[PDB]
Structure formats: C-alpha cells, structure tokens
C-alpha cells in the first residue's frame with residue numbers, strides 16, 4: 204500500500220489506456236501524411252486532440268503521486284515525463300496566443316515567397332525556389348539577393364512574433380521550476396539520483412564549449428582551405444584574412460558546406476562515387492533500396508523488419524492518386540506497428556538515408572518491450588546518431604563493392620580518400636560551429652544576457668567570431684535572421700545536432716573496434732559482424748530506462764560526450780589541410796565586411 | 800461410433816474472452832487427436848503431459864476444452880510455471896499440467912478497421928489465480944486504502960479492460976485464438992479413448 208505500489212498500478216492503467224489512444228493518434232496521422240485531405244486533417248486533429256487531452260488527464264492525476272516518497276527509478280522516470288506540466292501551467296488565454304504565435308510563425312516560414320525586381324512574374328519560395336539558388340548558383344548578386352530578400356521579407360515579419368515568443372516561453376519555463384526556456388531544453392540531458400552517472404543541465408554548456416575548443420584547429424584549417432578555394436570563384440568579394448560571406452556557403456544559412464564540394468574538391472579529376480547512375484542502369488527501385496537496407500541489419504544480428512512494415516509503409520511517391528509529405532520519416536505507432544514514410548527515388552542520397560531511417564526503426568523496435576513512457580532514445584541526440592552510423596558504414600567502398608553496386612576495379616587511393624573526407628567535413632564539421640553558435644544565441648536570449656535592442660548585433664558578433672561568417676548586408680533590429688531557419692521559428696531545439704555528431708563517431712569507433720576493423724576509421728563497414736550489432740543492441744533495448752551517461756558507456760566505454768573519436772575520423776584530412784594552408788592564413792578577423 | 804465434437808470447440812462461431820474463458824468437457828466419444836497436429840494450420844501446438852506423437856492410443860476419463868482469445872506475446876503465458884497478467888489474473892495452468900496448448904492467429908476474423916473491442920481481459924486482482932480458476936467479477940479494485948464504494952477513481956480502478964485488435968497491429972498484439980486440452984485421469988470408467 205505504498206505510494207510506489209499505488210503508482211505502479213496507476214502506471215499500469217496508463218500504459219494500457221494510452222496504447223490504444225496513442226495508436227488512434229498516429230494511425231489517423233498516417234492517413235493524412237499519405238492521403239492529404241482536409242477530411243483527414245480533422246481526423247488527424249480529432250484523434251490527436253483526444254490523445255493530448257488524455258495526456259493532460261493523466262498528468263494532473265499523476266501529480267498526486269509525489270516522487271519524494273518514491274525510490275524506484277524507472278517508476279520515477281515514467282512519472283516525471285508524465286507529471287510534466289508544460290504548456291498548461293500558463294494561463295488559459297496566453298496559452299492560446301502562444302500557440303497562435305507558433306502556428307503563425309510556422310505559417311509565414313512555409314508560405315514565404317519573394318520575387319526578383321528584374322522579372323516579378325515568377326516568385327520563389329524557400330523550397331524549391333530559393334534553396335536551389337543558394338545551392339547551385341555561382342553569381343554573387345543572385346546569391347546576395349536570395350539571401351537578403353528572404354530575411355528582409357519574411358524574417359522581419361517574425362521579429363515581433365519572436366519577441367512575444369520569448370516571453371511566453373520563459374513564463375512557462377520558470378513556472379515549471381526552470382531558469383529560462385533554454386534551461387528547459389537542457390533538461391533533456393539532466394540525470395538525478397544516479398551517483399556515478401549524474402549529469403545536470405549546466406554541465407551541458409560547459410561540455411559543449413569544452414569539446415568545441417578542440418574542434419577549432421580542424422575547423423580553422425577547413426575554414427581557411429575553402430576560403431582560398433572560394434577566392435578563386437569569387438575573386439573581387441572574398442578577402443584572405445576576413446570571414447566568409449554568409450550567402451556563399453552552400454545553402455541559405457550556411458548550416459552545411461556540402462554544396463561547396465564542386466568549388467573545393469581537392470582532386471576533382473579523380474572519379475566520384477555517386478552510385479546514383481549505376482542504380483538506374485541496374486533497374487533499381489524503391490523496394491530494392493530498402494530490401495538491401497534490411498540485409499545490412501540482419502548481417503549484424505538484428506531482426507528483420509516486421510511484415511506490417513512492408514505492407515503499410517509508403518516507400519515511393521503516391522503516384523498521382525494522393526499527395527504526401529515526402530520528407531523521410533520513421534514511425535513508431537505502438538501496438539508493434541512500425542512504418543517509414545519517404546518518397547524514394549533512385550539516388551545515392553536516398554540509398555543512404557534509407558539506412559538512416561531504417562536505423563530508427565531498429566532503435567524503435569528494440570525498446571518496444573520497455574514501458575510506453577520509456578520508448579524513446581537515451582537523449583535527444585541518440586536517435587539521430589544511430590541513424591548516421593548506418594549510412595557511414597554503407598557509404599564506404601568497402602560496402603558498395605560488397606553489394607555489387609560499384610565496379611570492383613575502382614582506383615581506391617589516398618587522393619580519393621581525401622575527396623571523401625573533404626565531402627564529409629563540409630557536412631559534418633561545417634555544421635558544428637553553426638549549431639553551437641546558433642543555440643548559444645538562443646541560450647543567452649532566453650536567460651536575458653542579450654537585450655532586445657541588440658539581438659541582431661550580438662547575433663552577427665558571434666557569427667564573425669565563433670563561426671567565421673560575416674553578413675553581406677548590415678541588419679538592424681528590424682531583422683530576425685535566426686527565425687529565417689526552420690528549427691528556430693518552429694520551436695525546435697538545435698543543440699541536438701551537435702551532440703548527435705559527437706555521439707555518432709563514439710558509436711562508430713566502438714562498433715568497428717568490436718567489428719574486427721583494420722585501417723582508418725572512415726573506411727569501416729560494420730555489416731557481417733554480429734559482435735558489433737550485439738554491443739549496439741544492448742543500448743537500443745534500454746531506451747529511456749537508464750540514463751544516457753550509463754547507456755553511452757554500454758557501447759563506447761565513457762560516461763560523457765567525447766570529441767576525440769570525431770577528430771580521428773578527419774585526421775587524414777586534418778594533416779592534409781595543415782600542409783595545404785602552409786602559405787595561407789588560418790583564422791579570421793572580425794572587423795572585415797564585404798560592404799565595408 | 801461417436802466422435803468427440805472438437806469442431807464445436809475449434810470451429811466455433813464466437814470465442815470467449817480470457818477473463819471469462821469457456822470450458823467444455825468432452826466425454827463418451829472417440830477422439831482422433833492426430834487430426835489436429837496433421838493440419839499445419841496452428842501457430843502453437845505444445846503438449847506438456849501428453850505427447851502429440853500419435854498417442855490417441857490411450858484412454859482418459861474426461862478431457863476439458865478451454866478456449867479464449869489473447870495477444871500474440873500472451874500465449875507464452877499459457878504454459879506451466881508462467882507469470883503475467885494472463886497467467887496470474889485470467890487463466891492459470893498447473894505446474895504439473897498434463898495436456899496440450901493449441902493456438903492460431905485470428906486477425907482475419909477477430910480484427911477490424913477502427914478497432915475490435917469485443918474481447919477484454921483482467922488487469923488487476925488482489926491475489927493470483929490457482930490452476931483452472933475463473934473470475935468473472937466486476938468489483939472495483941481498491942489499490943489505495945479508501946473505500947471505493949463501487950466507484951472508479953483515485954487508486955480505484957475497474958478490473959476489466961478492453962483489447963484493441965486492429966488489422967495493422969503487430970504480430971505480438973494480434974488476436975490469437977487459444978484452445979487448451981486438459982486430460983484428466985481418475986479411478987473412473989475412462990470415457991474417451993479414440994482409435
């Protein structure tokens with residue numbers, strides 16, 4: 204008759220009543236994202252509202268089970284995630300306006316359109332209009348126009364909404380016993396009550412800045428390398444000692460330097476891999492891409508996909524009978540139901556993300572035996588980290604020639620390895636300073652260390668210093684440039700992409716360590732090694748039951764995020780960048796500007 | 800020349816829920832047990848005291864045919880020395896069980912779009928079930944210490960909860976029709992033998 208045993212019975216009724224209500228939530232949400240209709244929209248809203256209304260029902264009843272008298276940790280965790288007040292401790296009127304802000308900020312982002320003053324007939328949205336200009340054009344002014352006009356015409360609309368978004372999110376945060384809304388997001392990493400694996404919210408910021416200091420030598424030589432390469436493509440605009448202009452970075456915000464590969468390829472006269480065309484000649488389709496991905500996981504001792512996965516999941520575009528959200532997703536609907544919604548084409552990018560998305564299901568299927576409230580990754584960065592390591596092992600020529608997609612007589616030498624690692628660094632290493640600086644800006648804005656009348660000045664102060672990227676047009680406080688990104692204006696934490704990067708290379712190093720791998724770490728392919736899949740499965744089946752500090756050690760052997768495995772993955776490129784910058788200037792000055 | 804009516808048990812129109820599992824004793828007849836195993840249509844055919852090795856060549860005084868519907872991962876609990884919601888609160892087999900456990904997937908009949916909720920089970924009970932005991936009570940389960948007075952509420956829950964049988968459910972959550980044959984021997988006329 205303890206509070207603990209009364210909670211175990213309360214959680215029993217919850218786990219059994221939530222299973223069907225959550226199933227009706229996503230089973231109706233599936234028929235919208237595949238058969239988009241205002242009828243299926245309300246069916247998705249009605250089923251989603253009753254599920255969220257059920258979560259509010261049980262939470263207030265879960266509040267009557269104080270955790271002070273409870274000592275079982277798994278019972279503590281399920282109640283904590285359930286006792287979460289969240290958006291409900293607010294008033295009943297500013298909770299509506301807060302959601303009205305979130306819905307309007309998302310609407311302006313997804314509906315924003317700009318047109319050029321030289322031919323206003325056609326008008327371009329972000330996708331696919333403006334994104335293609337920022338990822339394919341070498342015209343300085345065409346990139347400058349699409350860059351500025353996006354933040355000048357939709358970002359300025361979000362500045363007043365974001366200013367009201369910060370105060371309402373902070374009122375809800377401190378009403379939930381937090382310092383700020385940033386401290387509310389950092390709670391995903393907090394662990395209490397486990398001595399030897401405890402980890403508080405403030406410890407994340409110290410560790411993020413600590414590991415980032417050990418990446419700067421690699422990032423500076425990568426920054427200085429592409430800066431000299433960009434000077435050849437933009438001679439009258441780049442300066443060899445200043446920061447990189449923001450509109451010449453591969454996309455609209457410079458989140459990834461991937462599209463700069465054609466401008467910065469070290470050995471562009473060496474053959475690219477790009478198995479895309481080889482898939483079209485071999486009559487490949489959507490099913491063979493996923494069927495080949497299934498054989499990758501069963502080779503390391505993981506189970507095969509459920510029969511309902513092939514029956515229910517949509518693997519290609521509907522075919523002019525429906526319209527869908529072709530953004531790749533992995534679905535855990537409960538009741539043992541697992542799906543993947545992704546309109547695949549015959550492309551190497553889709554062949555790798557298929558292994559990435561199927562890696563989510565293997566994680567989802569592993570913690571299915573766990574209780575409902577513990578069916579999730581260890582932290583926010585775990586799910587996306589285990590997805591990247593599946594594409595890492597599948598993209599190497601060690602695996603491409605294995606499945607008979609690359610001609611065996613491929614000139615695999617030290618020059619092709621630099622090209623592959625340079626392509627990897629533009630996407631992986633290039634996003635770390637962008638991610639940390641962006642999240643810390645929101646971290647200091649939520650706490651209050653950045654006043655409202657200096658939001659954009661301190662935004663570009665850290666862009667020039669931390670990222671090494673300078674704006675091409677001076678922006679006053681009427682601009683809201685961070686909100687011009689999806690994750691900022693759609694209420695999403697962004698530091699998850701930083702820890703995901705470091706987690707994925709601690710995982711890959713430990714898996715290949717037990718996978719009998721000889722040679723550089725970047726040429727590894729964990730398939731056919733069931734010993735590596737078992738060491739990974741020992742963490743996936745845990746889910747949210749045990750702390751991420753302990754769950755991380757079950758694979759890697761360290762209780763905290765480590766940056767050393769990331770640096771050793773790119774060291775063959777690191778030393779190559781050191782000699783290629785012997786007569787270059789590594790670093791950047793903050794006072795330079797393309798507008799002077 | 801009377802064959803035991805096993806078709807009335809297996810091929811029955813509707814099945815009972817495991818909390819109110821239906822027992823039907825079979826006596827004074829002829830049983831061709833090997834017909835059941837020579838079918839290859841059953842998901843689970845495990846015998847524990849008898850052997851499916853064509854041992855219809857023996858007699859028993861009375862054999863009982865218990866049938867119910869549970870989930871896929873819950874037929875594991877239909878075995879001697881098992882625990883769980885089905886084994887503890889719904890249907891319990893003895894540690895010295897002598898018989899066979901037969902089951903097969905029935906998502907084609909007992910599952911429909913929108914959810915089939917006709918079958919239900921018992922989630923809470925003050926004590927475990929002794930072998931072959933059945934409870935069809937609806938009294939409110941007092942989890943706390945305040946008198947529930949026959950009402951649901953805080954630490955006072957209704958004991959019977961519904962199964963959700965959707966056609967898109969996983970194999971572990973799909974409805975499975977189970978039939979348990981328990982052979983009993985006493986100092987009795989040994990009714991059913993079967994050639």
Ligand SMILES: *[C@@H]1O[C@H](CO)[C@@H](O[C@@H]2O[C@H](CO)[C@@H](O)[C@H](O)[C@H]2NC(C)=O)[C@H](O)[C@H]1NC(C)=O
Nearest residue numbers: 211274275276277278279572573574748882883
């Ligand atoms: C916290 O409670 C859980 C739930 O009872 C304990 O775990 C279980 O152990 C029993 C055996 O005693 C098994 O029958 C259950 O299947 C287990 N369930 C789960 C969810 O693990 C757990 O040991 C308790 N923790 C502590 C520290 O006492």
Ligand SMILES: *[C@@H]1O[C@H](CO)[C@@H](O[C@@H]2O[C@H](CO)[C@@H](O)[C@H](O)[C@H]2NC(C)=O)[C@H](O)[C@H]1NC(C)=O
Nearest residue numbers: 263266283286287288289291292293378379380
């Ligand atoms: C969630 O919010 C409720 C209030 O909505 C918090 O509870 C109050 O609890 C104290 C006792 O500590 C009472 O004196 C108040 O009267 C309660 N308020 C209301 C409105 O009933 C609760 O502590 C919050 N829980 C968490 C985890 O944040």
Ligand SMILES: *[C@@H]1O[C@H](CO)[C@@H](O)[C@H](O)[C@H]1NC(C)=O
Nearest residue numbers: 234238239240242243524525
């Ligand atoms: C899409 O939904 C409508 C009703 O909302 C239905 O009539 C139609 O058959 C569905 N389309 C497909 C391809 O299932």
Ligand SMILES: *[C@@H]1O[C@H](CO)[C@@H](O)[C@H](O)[C@H]1NC(C)=O
Nearest residue numbers: 494497498501505506507508
């Ligand atoms: C799926 O796994 C089972 C394991 O029992 C195996 O027998 C079967 O051959 C596998 N099928 C495929 C297509 O991988």
Ligand SMILES: *[C@@H]1O[C@H](CO)[C@@H](O)[C@H](O)[C@H]1NC(C)=O
Nearest residue numbers: 502601602605606728730731
């Ligand atoms: C795995 O082993 C099978 C045969 O056992 C072989 O056909 C396949 O190419 C191997 N794959 C890798 C990546 O070694």
Ligand SMILES: *[C@@H]1O[C@H](CO)[C@@H](O)[C@H](O)[C@H]1NC(C)=O
Nearest residue numbers: 804805806807808809810834
């Ligand atoms: C049930 O009916 C099928 C045909 O519908 C038959 O083959 C089978 O033998 C029957 N089972 C019993 C136990 O009579």
Ligand SMILES: [Zn+2]
Nearest residue numbers: 559560587590
């Ligand atoms: Zn993913």
